[PDB]
Amino acid sequence: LHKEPATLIKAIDGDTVKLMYKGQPMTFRLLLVDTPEFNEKYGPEASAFTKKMHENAKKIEVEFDKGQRTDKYGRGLAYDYADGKMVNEALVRQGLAKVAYVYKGNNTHEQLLRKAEAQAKKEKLNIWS
Ligand SMILES: Cc1cn([C@H]2C[C@H](OP(=O)(O)O)[C@@H](COP(=O)(O)O)O2)c(=O)[nH]c1=O
Ligand SMILES: [Ca+2]
């Protein structure tokens, strides 16, 4: 896989963000994770986490996997990097997202995220408390 540029347009919630990609506004849905909705427990914390991570970044990148690049709602499906640090992974590592939505052919970073989730669970963080 490879990283490609994007710029933040606006925070949305824990696992979706509006980015400009190839010069077009898109909503991106983060691969292989599920954050709580804003109205749910740890939703506001997940939203804040993802907002901060994108807003503080000098450089945002997206990395598409080998399969589907947009979902049925027109959202881009990607791994999102803030100054080289994967947002998807960080969410999981902090207990603010579960590994989820693992479809065959877009699951390159599955095991990386599962390892993170295991560490979050061991530390009893957030969703795992
Ligand atoms: C993460 C992801 C979600 N989706 C779809 C499945 C779910 O369909 P349904 O809306 O029918 O439940 C939905 C979950 O996203 P959200 O967690 O953003 O709701 O997005 C994909 O198709 N591919 C993906 O990789
Ligand atoms: Ca969600």
Side-chain angles (χ1 to χ4, degrees):
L1 308 189
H2 70 285
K3 290 170 191 54
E4 295 177 61
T7 57
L8 177 69
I9 297 176
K10 208 189 217 287
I12 303 173
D13 78 344
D15 56 23
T16 60
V17 60
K18 197 100 195 171
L19 305 173
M20 195 187 287
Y21 170 68
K22 291 182 162 186
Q24 303 309 325
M26 288 176 58
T27 301
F28 280 81
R29 178 59 170 86
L30 295 178
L31 281 175
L32 298 191
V33 304
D34 191 34
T35 51
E37 305 298 320
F38 183 78
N39 75 298
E40 289 160 354
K41 193 171 211 312
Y42 301 115
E45 288 75 18
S47 296
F49 185 97
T50 300
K51 174 150 159 5
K52 178 175 195 190
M53 186 160 186
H54 284 103
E55 272 171 15
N56 292 5
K58 173 161 63 190
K59 146 170 117 178
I60 301 305
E61 298 169 279
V62 298
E63 176 184 65
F64 295 101
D65 208 317
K66 280 147 209 145
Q68 164 157 113
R69 302 187 163 195
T70 64
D71 65 21
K72 66 194 189 177
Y73 302 115
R75 303 181 296 178
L77 295 171
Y79 310 101
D80 181 331
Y81 292 90
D83 292 324
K85 180 73 174 335
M86 204 207 295
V87 175
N88 314 54
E89 190 190 14
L91 276 157
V92 172
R93 179 56 187 88
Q94 283 322 118
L96 291 168
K98 291 186 191 185
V99 180
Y101 292 102
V102 178
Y103 302 89
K104 188 203 167 86
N106 270 346
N107 71 338
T108 295
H109 298 302
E110 180 179 13
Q111 291 302 131
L112 181 77
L113 269 53
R114 292 208 186 270
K115 177 60 174 289
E117 186 176 269
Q119 241 351 98
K121 289 202 199 164
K122 281 224 294 318
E123 294 165 15
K124 291 308 174 41
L125 296 181
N126 287 317
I127 286 174
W128 307 114
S129 63

PDB file of all heavy atoms in Angstrom, residues 40-75:
ATOM      1  N   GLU A  40     -23.346   7.983  22.202  1.00  0.00           N
ATOM      2  CA  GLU A  40     -23.052   6.776  23.002  1.00  0.00           C
ATOM      3  C   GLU A  40     -21.888   6.996  23.966  1.00  0.00           C
ATOM      4  O   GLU A  40     -21.124   7.963  23.840  1.00  0.00           O
ATOM      5  CB  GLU A  40     -22.749   5.591  22.083  1.00  0.00           C
ATOM      6  CG  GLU A  40     -23.981   5.058  21.325  1.00  0.00           C
ATOM      7  CD  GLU A  40     -23.681   4.202  20.060  1.00  0.00           C
ATOM      8  OE1 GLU A  40     -22.529   4.073  19.653  1.00  0.00           O
ATOM      9  OE2 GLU A  40     -24.632   3.783  19.354  1.00  0.00           O
ATOM     10  N   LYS A  41     -21.716   6.056  24.883  1.00  0.00           N
ATOM     11  CA  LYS A  41     -20.644   6.148  25.837  1.00  0.00           C
ATOM     12  C   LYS A  41     -19.285   6.092  25.122  1.00  0.00           C
ATOM     13  O   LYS A  41     -19.092   5.250  24.226  1.00  0.00           O
ATOM     14  CB  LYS A  41     -20.747   5.021  26.846  1.00  0.00           C
ATOM     15  CG  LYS A  41     -19.848   5.263  28.029  1.00  0.00           C
ATOM     16  CD  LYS A  41     -20.083   4.273  29.136  1.00  0.00           C
ATOM     17  CE  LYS A  41     -19.804   4.921  30.486  1.00  0.00           C
ATOM     18  NZ  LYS A  41     -18.505   5.647  30.458  1.00  0.00           N
ATOM     19  N   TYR A  42     -18.397   7.036  25.483  1.00  0.00           N
ATOM     20  CA  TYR A  42     -17.074   7.225  24.823  1.00  0.00           C
ATOM     21  C   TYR A  42     -17.150   7.785  23.401  1.00  0.00           C
ATOM     22  O   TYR A  42     -16.101   7.960  22.750  1.00  0.00           O
ATOM     23  CB  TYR A  42     -16.233   5.935  24.834  1.00  0.00           C
ATOM     24  CG  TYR A  42     -15.977   5.448  26.249  1.00  0.00           C
ATOM     25  CD1 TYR A  42     -16.505   4.246  26.693  1.00  0.00           C
ATOM     26  CD2 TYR A  42     -15.212   6.207  27.119  1.00  0.00           C
ATOM     27  CE1 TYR A  42     -16.272   3.792  27.998  1.00  0.00           C
ATOM     28  CE2 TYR A  42     -14.939   5.775  28.396  1.00  0.00           C
ATOM     29  CZ  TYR A  42     -15.515   4.578  28.859  1.00  0.00           C
ATOM     30  OH  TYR A  42     -15.281   4.200  30.197  1.00  0.00           O
ATOM     31  N   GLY A  43     -18.359   8.051  22.899  1.00  0.00           N
ATOM     32  CA  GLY A  43     -18.500   8.773  21.635  1.00  0.00           C
ATOM     33  C   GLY A  43     -17.882  10.134  21.643  1.00  0.00           C
ATOM     34  O   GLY A  43     -17.149  10.491  20.761  1.00  0.00           O
ATOM     35  N   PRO A  44     -18.260  10.981  22.624  1.00  0.00           N
ATOM     36  CA  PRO A  44     -17.630  12.285  22.651  1.00  0.00           C
ATOM     37  C   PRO A  44     -16.109  12.264  22.807  1.00  0.00           C
ATOM     38  O   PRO A  44     -15.402  13.027  22.134  1.00  0.00           O
ATOM     39  CB  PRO A  44     -18.307  12.984  23.866  1.00  0.00           C
ATOM     40  CG  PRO A  44     -19.579  12.229  24.092  1.00  0.00           C
ATOM     41  CD  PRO A  44     -19.276  10.810  23.657  1.00  0.00           C
ATOM     42  N   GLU A  45     -15.599  11.322  23.581  1.00  0.00           N
ATOM     43  CA  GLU A  45     -14.139  11.157  23.729  1.00  0.00           C
ATOM     44  C   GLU A  45     -13.435  10.687  22.434  1.00  0.00           C
ATOM     45  O   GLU A  45     -12.339  11.158  22.034  1.00  0.00           O
ATOM     46  CB  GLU A  45     -13.863  10.178  24.837  1.00  0.00           C
ATOM     47  CG  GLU A  45     -14.165  10.753  26.227  1.00  0.00           C
ATOM     48  CD  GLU A  45     -15.638  10.839  26.553  1.00  0.00           C
ATOM     49  OE1 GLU A  45     -16.437  10.189  25.918  1.00  0.00           O
ATOM     50  OE2 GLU A  45     -15.996  11.452  27.588  1.00  0.00           O
ATOM     51  N   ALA A  46     -14.093   9.794  21.736  1.00  0.00           N
ATOM     52  CA  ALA A  46     -13.568   9.329  20.440  1.00  0.00           C
ATOM     53  C   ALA A  46     -13.544  10.424  19.405  1.00  0.00           C
ATOM     54  O   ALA A  46     -12.542  10.654  18.771  1.00  0.00           O
ATOM     55  CB  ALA A  46     -14.426   8.216  19.968  1.00  0.00           C
ATOM     56  N   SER A  47     -14.624  11.213  19.370  1.00  0.00           N
ATOM     57  CA  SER A  47     -14.717  12.345  18.467  1.00  0.00           C
ATOM     58  C   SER A  47     -13.634  13.335  18.757  1.00  0.00           C
ATOM     59  O   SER A  47     -12.994  13.836  17.841  1.00  0.00           O
ATOM     60  CB  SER A  47     -16.081  13.030  18.500  1.00  0.00           C
ATOM     61  OG  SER A  47     -17.166  12.227  18.063  1.00  0.00           O
ATOM     62  N   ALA A  48     -13.438  13.671  20.053  1.00  0.00           N
ATOM     63  CA  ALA A  48     -12.421  14.637  20.445  1.00  0.00           C
ATOM     64  C   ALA A  48     -11.020  14.136  20.072  1.00  0.00           C
ATOM     65  O   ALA A  48     -10.150  14.926  19.679  1.00  0.00           O
ATOM     66  CB  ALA A  48     -12.484  14.851  21.963  1.00  0.00           C
ATOM     67  N   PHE A  49     -10.796  12.841  20.317  1.00  0.00           N
ATOM     68  CA  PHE A  49      -9.515  12.218  20.002  1.00  0.00           C
ATOM     69  C   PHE A  49      -9.152  12.338  18.510  1.00  0.00           C
ATOM     70  O   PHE A  49      -8.122  12.876  18.154  1.00  0.00           O
ATOM     71  CB  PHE A  49      -9.533  10.754  20.412  1.00  0.00           C
ATOM     72  CG  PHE A  49      -8.205  10.068  20.239  1.00  0.00           C
ATOM     73  CD1 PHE A  49      -7.356   9.927  21.289  1.00  0.00           C
ATOM     74  CD2 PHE A  49      -7.856   9.511  19.005  1.00  0.00           C
ATOM     75  CE1 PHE A  49      -6.119   9.318  21.147  1.00  0.00           C
ATOM     76  CE2 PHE A  49      -6.648   8.883  18.849  1.00  0.00           C
ATOM     77  CZ  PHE A  49      -5.784   8.737  19.944  1.00  0.00           C
ATOM     78  N   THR A  50     -10.062  11.910  17.645  1.00  0.00           N
ATOM     79  CA  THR A  50      -9.884  12.017  16.218  1.00  0.00           C
ATOM     80  C   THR A  50      -9.799  13.463  15.712  1.00  0.00           C
ATOM     81  O   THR A  50      -8.933  13.773  14.888  1.00  0.00           O
ATOM     82  CB  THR A  50     -11.002  11.247  15.516  1.00  0.00           C
ATOM     83  OG1 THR A  50     -10.894   9.901  15.935  1.00  0.00           O
ATOM     84  CG2 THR A  50     -10.869  11.342  13.960  1.00  0.00           C
ATOM     85  N   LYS A  51     -10.555  14.370  16.341  1.00  0.00           N
ATOM     86  CA  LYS A  51     -10.516  15.779  15.924  1.00  0.00           C
ATOM     87  C   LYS A  51      -9.118  16.350  16.190  1.00  0.00           C
ATOM     88  O   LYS A  51      -8.531  17.047  15.322  1.00  0.00           O
ATOM     89  CB  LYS A  51     -11.594  16.564  16.668  1.00  0.00           C
ATOM     90  CG  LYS A  51     -11.598  18.073  16.463  1.00  0.00           C
ATOM     91  CD  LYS A  51     -13.052  18.572  16.597  1.00  0.00           C
ATOM     92  CE  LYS A  51     -13.263  20.044  16.925  1.00  0.00           C
ATOM     93  NZ  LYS A  51     -12.012  20.832  16.953  1.00  0.00           N
ATOM     94  N   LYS A  52      -8.626  16.106  17.413  1.00  0.00           N
ATOM     95  CA  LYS A  52      -7.339  16.608  17.840  1.00  0.00           C
ATOM     96  C   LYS A  52      -6.211  16.067  17.028  1.00  0.00           C
ATOM     97  O   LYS A  52      -5.384  16.800  16.554  1.00  0.00           O
ATOM     98  CB  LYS A  52      -7.088  16.295  19.313  1.00  0.00           C
ATOM     99  CG  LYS A  52      -5.732  16.755  19.764  1.00  0.00           C
ATOM    100  CD  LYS A  52      -5.525  16.562  21.265  1.00  0.00           C
ATOM    101  CE  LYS A  52      -4.311  17.356  21.728  1.00  0.00           C
ATOM    102  NZ  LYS A  52      -3.922  17.023  23.113  1.00  0.00           N
ATOM    103  N   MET A  53      -6.311  14.797  16.671  1.00  0.00           N
ATOM    104  CA  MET A  53      -5.241  14.152  15.971  1.00  0.00           C
ATOM    105  C   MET A  53      -5.105  14.713  14.556  1.00  0.00           C
ATOM    106  O   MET A  53      -3.966  14.989  14.063  1.00  0.00           O
ATOM    107  CB  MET A  53      -5.441  12.632  16.018  1.00  0.00           C
ATOM    108  CG  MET A  53      -4.299  11.841  15.435  1.00  0.00           C
ATOM    109  SD  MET A  53      -4.381  10.162  16.071  1.00  0.00           S
ATOM    110  CE  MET A  53      -2.889   9.470  15.417  1.00  0.00           C
ATOM    111  N   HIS A  54      -6.232  15.019  13.945  1.00  0.00           N
ATOM    112  CA  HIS A  54      -6.201  15.608  12.598  1.00  0.00           C
ATOM    113  C   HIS A  54      -5.838  17.098  12.660  1.00  0.00           C
ATOM    114  O   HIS A  54      -5.156  17.614  11.771  1.00  0.00           O
ATOM    115  CB  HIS A  54      -7.557  15.458  11.901  1.00  0.00           C
ATOM    116  CG  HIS A  54      -7.828  14.087  11.394  1.00  0.00           C
ATOM    117  ND1 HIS A  54      -8.666  13.221  12.041  1.00  0.00           N
ATOM    118  CD2 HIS A  54      -7.465  13.464  10.256  1.00  0.00           C
ATOM    119  CE1 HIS A  54      -8.719  12.078  11.384  1.00  0.00           C
ATOM    120  NE2 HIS A  54      -7.960  12.186  10.327  1.00  0.00           N
ATOM    121  N   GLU A  55      -6.306  17.786  13.691  1.00  0.00           N
ATOM    122  CA  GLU A  55      -6.128  19.257  13.748  1.00  0.00           C
ATOM    123  C   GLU A  55      -4.703  19.641  14.122  1.00  0.00           C
ATOM    124  O   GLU A  55      -4.170  20.685  13.683  1.00  0.00           O
ATOM    125  CB  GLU A  55      -7.131  19.907  14.700  1.00  0.00           C
ATOM    126  CG  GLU A  55      -8.421  20.227  13.939  1.00  0.00           C
ATOM    127  CD  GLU A  55      -9.569  20.681  14.796  1.00  0.00           C
ATOM    128  OE1 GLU A  55      -9.359  21.040  15.979  1.00  0.00           O
ATOM    129  OE2 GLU A  55     -10.705  20.623  14.276  1.00  0.00           O
ATOM    130  N   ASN A  56      -4.071  18.796  14.909  1.00  0.00           N
ATOM    131  CA  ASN A  56      -2.710  19.034  15.298  1.00  0.00           C
ATOM    132  C   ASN A  56      -1.679  18.580  14.257  1.00  0.00           C
ATOM    133  O   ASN A  56      -0.540  18.998  14.342  1.00  0.00           O
ATOM    134  CB  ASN A  56      -2.427  18.408  16.663  1.00  0.00           C
ATOM    135  CG  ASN A  56      -3.179  19.106  17.797  1.00  0.00           C
ATOM    136  OD1 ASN A  56      -3.986  20.011  17.581  1.00  0.00           O
ATOM    137  ND2 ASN A  56      -2.932  18.655  19.011  1.00  0.00           N
ATOM    138  N   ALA A  57      -2.101  17.867  13.218  1.00  0.00           N
ATOM    139  CA  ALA A  57      -1.165  17.276  12.291  1.00  0.00           C
ATOM    140  C   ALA A  57      -0.628  18.340  11.346  1.00  0.00           C
ATOM    141  O   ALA A  57      -1.391  19.110  10.765  1.00  0.00           O
ATOM    142  CB  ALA A  57      -1.802  16.138  11.493  1.00  0.00           C
ATOM    143  N   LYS A  58       0.671  18.290  11.104  1.00  0.00           N
ATOM    144  CA  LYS A  58       1.240  19.052  10.049  1.00  0.00           C
ATOM    145  C   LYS A  58       0.781  18.509   8.703  1.00  0.00           C
ATOM    146  O   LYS A  58       0.524  19.270   7.798  1.00  0.00           O
ATOM    147  CB  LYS A  58       2.776  19.036  10.115  1.00  0.00           C
ATOM    148  CG  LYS A  58       3.425  19.715   8.880  1.00  0.00           C
ATOM    149  CD  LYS A  58       4.902  20.149   9.063  1.00  0.00           C
ATOM    150  CE  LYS A  58       5.825  18.948   9.308  1.00  0.00           C
ATOM    151  NZ  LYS A  58       7.225  19.340   9.717  1.00  0.00           N
ATOM    152  N   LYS A  59       0.698  17.198   8.605  1.00  0.00           N
ATOM    153  CA  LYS A  59       0.432  16.515   7.336  1.00  0.00           C
ATOM    154  C   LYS A  59      -0.501  15.338   7.589  1.00  0.00           C
ATOM    155  O   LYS A  59      -0.289  14.530   8.540  1.00  0.00           O
ATOM    156  CB  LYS A  59       1.765  16.079   6.780  1.00  0.00           C
ATOM    157  CG  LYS A  59       1.823  14.794   6.017  1.00  0.00           C
ATOM    158  CD  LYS A  59       3.160  14.588   5.314  1.00  0.00           C
ATOM    159  CE  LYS A  59       3.954  13.380   5.796  1.00  0.00           C
ATOM    160  NZ  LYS A  59       5.250  13.190   5.030  1.00  0.00           N
ATOM    161  N   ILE A  60      -1.600  15.301   6.804  1.00  0.00           N
ATOM    162  CA  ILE A  60      -2.514  14.202   6.792  1.00  0.00           C
ATOM    163  C   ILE A  60      -2.275  13.400   5.489  1.00  0.00           C
ATOM    164  O   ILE A  60      -2.101  13.984   4.420  1.00  0.00           O
ATOM    165  CB  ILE A  60      -4.002  14.684   6.772  1.00  0.00           C
ATOM    166  CG1 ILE A  60      -4.351  15.553   7.992  1.00  0.00           C
ATOM    167  CG2 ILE A  60      -4.986  13.475   6.652  1.00  0.00           C
ATOM    168  CD1 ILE A  60      -4.067  14.909   9.294  1.00  0.00           C
ATOM    169  N   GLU A  61      -2.292  12.062   5.632  1.00  0.00           N
ATOM    170  CA  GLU A  61      -2.235  11.181   4.494  1.00  0.00           C
ATOM    171  C   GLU A  61      -3.344  10.134   4.589  1.00  0.00           C
ATOM    172  O   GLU A  61      -3.709   9.676   5.697  1.00  0.00           O
ATOM    173  CB  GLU A  61      -0.833  10.540   4.428  1.00  0.00           C
ATOM    174  CG  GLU A  61       0.293  11.534   4.238  1.00  0.00           C
ATOM    175  CD  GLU A  61       1.602  10.857   4.454  1.00  0.00           C
ATOM    176  OE1 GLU A  61       1.994  10.690   5.653  1.00  0.00           O
ATOM    177  OE2 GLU A  61       2.271  10.542   3.438  1.00  0.00           O
ATOM    178  N   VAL A  62      -3.797   9.699   3.401  1.00  0.00           N
ATOM    179  CA  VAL A  62      -4.681   8.530   3.295  1.00  0.00           C
ATOM    180  C   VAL A  62      -3.991   7.392   2.582  1.00  0.00           C
ATOM    181  O   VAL A  62      -3.232   7.617   1.654  1.00  0.00           O
ATOM    182  CB  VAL A  62      -6.054   8.882   2.634  1.00  0.00           C
ATOM    183  CG1 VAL A  62      -6.736   9.913   3.552  1.00  0.00           C
ATOM    184  CG2 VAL A  62      -5.871   9.359   1.206  1.00  0.00           C
ATOM    185  N   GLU A  63      -4.340   6.159   2.995  1.00  0.00           N
ATOM    186  CA  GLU A  63      -3.809   4.961   2.385  1.00  0.00           C
ATOM    187  C   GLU A  63      -4.988   4.032   2.122  1.00  0.00           C
ATOM    188  O   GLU A  63      -5.611   3.544   3.049  1.00  0.00           O
ATOM    189  CB  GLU A  63      -2.780   4.346   3.316  1.00  0.00           C
ATOM    190  CG  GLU A  63      -2.161   3.007   2.892  1.00  0.00           C
ATOM    191  CD  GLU A  63      -1.241   2.487   3.955  1.00  0.00           C
ATOM    192  OE1 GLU A  63      -1.732   2.151   5.080  1.00  0.00           O
ATOM    193  OE2 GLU A  63       0.015   2.538   3.732  1.00  0.00           O
ATOM    194  N   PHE A  64      -5.275   3.789   0.842  1.00  0.00           N
ATOM    195  CA  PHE A  64      -6.303   2.874   0.470  1.00  0.00           C
ATOM    196  C   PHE A  64      -5.748   1.453   0.526  1.00  0.00           C
ATOM    197  O   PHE A  64      -4.527   1.251   0.466  1.00  0.00           O
ATOM    198  CB  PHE A  64      -6.809   3.170  -0.951  1.00  0.00           C
ATOM    199  CG  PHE A  64      -7.496   4.494  -1.100  1.00  0.00           C
ATOM    200  CD1 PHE A  64      -6.815   5.600  -1.656  1.00  0.00           C
ATOM    201  CD2 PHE A  64      -8.812   4.667  -0.703  1.00  0.00           C
ATOM    202  CE1 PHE A  64      -7.459   6.813  -1.802  1.00  0.00           C
ATOM    203  CE2 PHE A  64      -9.428   5.914  -0.805  1.00  0.00           C
ATOM    204  CZ  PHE A  64      -8.712   7.008  -1.247  1.00  0.00           C
ATOM    205  N   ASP A  65      -6.631   0.475   0.778  1.00  0.00           N
ATOM    206  CA  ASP A  65      -6.252  -0.896   0.832  1.00  0.00           C
ATOM    207  C   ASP A  65      -6.411  -1.462  -0.602  1.00  0.00           C
ATOM    208  O   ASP A  65      -6.555  -0.710  -1.562  1.00  0.00           O
ATOM    209  CB  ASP A  65      -7.094  -1.640   1.873  1.00  0.00           C
ATOM    210  CG  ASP A  65      -6.386  -2.842   2.478  1.00  0.00           C
ATOM    211  OD1 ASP A  65      -5.735  -3.599   1.698  1.00  0.00           O
ATOM    212  OD2 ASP A  65      -6.474  -3.018   3.716  1.00  0.00           O
ATOM    213  N   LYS A  66      -6.496  -2.768  -0.725  1.00  0.00           N
ATOM    214  CA  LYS A  66      -6.437  -3.423  -2.071  1.00  0.00           C
ATOM    215  C   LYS A  66      -7.803  -3.579  -2.727  1.00  0.00           C
ATOM    216  O   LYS A  66      -7.928  -3.846  -3.978  1.00  0.00           O
ATOM    217  CB  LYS A  66      -5.750  -4.786  -1.941  1.00  0.00           C
ATOM    218  CG  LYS A  66      -4.234  -4.671  -1.882  1.00  0.00           C
ATOM    219  CD  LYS A  66      -3.629  -5.765  -1.003  1.00  0.00           C
ATOM    220  CE  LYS A  66      -2.296  -5.359  -0.330  1.00  0.00           C
ATOM    221  NZ  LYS A  66      -2.096  -5.923   1.055  1.00  0.00           N
ATOM    222  N   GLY A  67      -8.839  -3.376  -1.944  1.00  0.00           N
ATOM    223  CA  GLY A  67     -10.176  -3.555  -2.405  1.00  0.00           C
ATOM    224  C   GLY A  67     -10.924  -2.243  -2.583  1.00  0.00           C
ATOM    225  O   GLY A  67     -10.441  -1.256  -3.125  1.00  0.00           O
ATOM    226  N   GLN A  68     -12.161  -2.310  -2.202  1.00  0.00           N
ATOM    227  CA  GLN A  68     -13.108  -1.252  -2.357  1.00  0.00           C
ATOM    228  C   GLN A  68     -12.576   0.039  -1.764  1.00  0.00           C
ATOM    229  O   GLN A  68     -12.071   0.017  -0.640  1.00  0.00           O
ATOM    230  CB  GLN A  68     -14.386  -1.695  -1.621  1.00  0.00           C
ATOM    231  CG  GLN A  68     -15.355  -0.590  -1.351  1.00  0.00           C
ATOM    232  CD  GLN A  68     -16.753  -1.106  -1.159  1.00  0.00           C
ATOM    233  OE1 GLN A  68     -17.325  -1.030  -0.067  1.00  0.00           O
ATOM    234  NE2 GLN A  68     -17.306  -1.649  -2.221  1.00  0.00           N
ATOM    235  N   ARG A  69     -12.629   1.139  -2.511  1.00  0.00           N
ATOM    236  CA  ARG A  69     -12.135   2.442  -1.985  1.00  0.00           C
ATOM    237  C   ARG A  69     -13.236   3.376  -1.539  1.00  0.00           C
ATOM    238  O   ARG A  69     -12.994   4.375  -0.820  1.00  0.00           O
ATOM    239  CB  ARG A  69     -11.229   3.185  -2.979  1.00  0.00           C
ATOM    240  CG  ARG A  69     -10.009   2.387  -3.410  1.00  0.00           C
ATOM    241  CD  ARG A  69      -9.051   3.208  -4.258  1.00  0.00           C
ATOM    242  NE  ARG A  69      -7.729   2.562  -4.319  1.00  0.00           N
ATOM    243  CZ  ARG A  69      -6.619   3.186  -4.735  1.00  0.00           C
ATOM    244  NH1 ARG A  69      -6.681   4.434  -5.178  1.00  0.00           N
ATOM    245  NH2 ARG A  69      -5.438   2.579  -4.695  1.00  0.00           N
ATOM    246  N   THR A  70     -14.457   3.039  -1.903  1.00  0.00           N
ATOM    247  CA  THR A  70     -15.619   3.823  -1.395  1.00  0.00           C
ATOM    248  C   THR A  70     -16.686   2.841  -0.924  1.00  0.00           C
ATOM    249  O   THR A  70     -16.830   1.739  -1.464  1.00  0.00           O
ATOM    250  CB  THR A  70     -16.180   4.740  -2.503  1.00  0.00           C
ATOM    251  OG1 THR A  70     -16.665   3.933  -3.514  1.00  0.00           O
ATOM    252  CG2 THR A  70     -15.092   5.565  -3.160  1.00  0.00           C
ATOM    253  N   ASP A  71     -17.421   3.190   0.117  1.00  0.00           N
ATOM    254  CA  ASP A  71     -18.491   2.315   0.561  1.00  0.00           C
ATOM    255  C   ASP A  71     -19.815   2.736  -0.085  1.00  0.00           C
ATOM    256  O   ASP A  71     -19.858   3.592  -0.955  1.00  0.00           O
ATOM    257  CB  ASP A  71     -18.631   2.297   2.112  1.00  0.00           C
ATOM    258  CG  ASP A  71     -19.056   3.623   2.681  1.00  0.00           C
ATOM    259  OD1 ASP A  71     -19.641   4.478   1.940  1.00  0.00           O
ATOM    260  OD2 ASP A  71     -19.038   3.746   3.913  1.00  0.00           O
ATOM    261  N   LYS A  72     -20.914   2.085   0.319  1.00  0.00           N
ATOM    262  CA  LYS A  72     -22.165   2.261  -0.349  1.00  0.00           C
ATOM    263  C   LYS A  72     -22.791   3.636  -0.113  1.00  0.00           C
ATOM    264  O   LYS A  72     -23.765   4.007  -0.831  1.00  0.00           O
ATOM    265  CB  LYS A  72     -23.113   1.197   0.124  1.00  0.00           C
ATOM    266  CG  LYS A  72     -23.471   1.333   1.609  1.00  0.00           C
ATOM    267  CD  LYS A  72     -24.123   0.066   2.094  1.00  0.00           C
ATOM    268  CE  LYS A  72     -24.687   0.255   3.480  1.00  0.00           C
ATOM    269  NZ  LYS A  72     -25.405  -0.998   3.918  1.00  0.00           N
ATOM    270  N   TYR A  73     -22.251   4.390   0.848  1.00  0.00           N
ATOM    271  CA  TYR A  73     -22.684   5.736   1.099  1.00  0.00           C
ATOM    272  C   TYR A  73     -21.778   6.774   0.438  1.00  0.00           C
ATOM    273  O   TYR A  73     -21.977   7.989   0.669  1.00  0.00           O
ATOM    274  CB  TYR A  73     -22.687   6.005   2.603  1.00  0.00           C
ATOM    275  CG  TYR A  73     -23.583   5.047   3.356  1.00  0.00           C
ATOM    276  CD1 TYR A  73     -23.044   4.125   4.286  1.00  0.00           C
ATOM    277  CD2 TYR A  73     -24.988   5.024   3.142  1.00  0.00           C
ATOM    278  CE1 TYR A  73     -23.842   3.268   5.010  1.00  0.00           C
ATOM    279  CE2 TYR A  73     -25.778   4.165   3.895  1.00  0.00           C
ATOM    280  CZ  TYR A  73     -25.208   3.346   4.869  1.00  0.00           C
ATOM    281  OH  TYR A  73     -26.022   2.428   5.486  1.00  0.00           O
ATOM    282  N   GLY A  74     -20.833   6.324  -0.372  1.00  0.00           N
ATOM    283  CA  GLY A  74     -19.883   7.239  -1.020  1.00  0.00           C
ATOM    284  C   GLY A  74     -18.719   7.687  -0.117  1.00  0.00           C
ATOM    285  O   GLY A  74     -17.983   8.595  -0.463  1.00  0.00           O
ATOM    286  N   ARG A  75     -18.615   7.140   1.070  1.00  0.00           N
ATOM    287  CA  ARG A  75     -17.447   7.435   1.911  1.00  0.00           C
ATOM    288  C   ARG A  75     -16.202   6.714   1.476  1.00  0.00           C
ATOM    289  O   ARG A  75     -16.245   5.564   1.080  1.00  0.00           O
ATOM    290  CB  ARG A  75     -17.738   7.043   3.378  1.00  0.00           C
ATOM    291  CG  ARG A  75     -18.981   7.743   3.943  1.00  0.00           C
ATOM    292  CD  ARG A  75     -19.229   7.379   5.377  1.00  0.00           C
ATOM    293  NE  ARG A  75     -19.527   5.968   5.528  1.00  0.00           N
ATOM    294  CZ  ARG A  75     -19.745   5.380   6.693  1.00  0.00           C
ATOM    295  NH1 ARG A  75     -19.891   6.088   7.826  1.00  0.00           N
ATOM    296  NH2 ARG A  75     -19.772   4.062   6.742  1.00  0.00           N
TER     297      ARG A  75
END
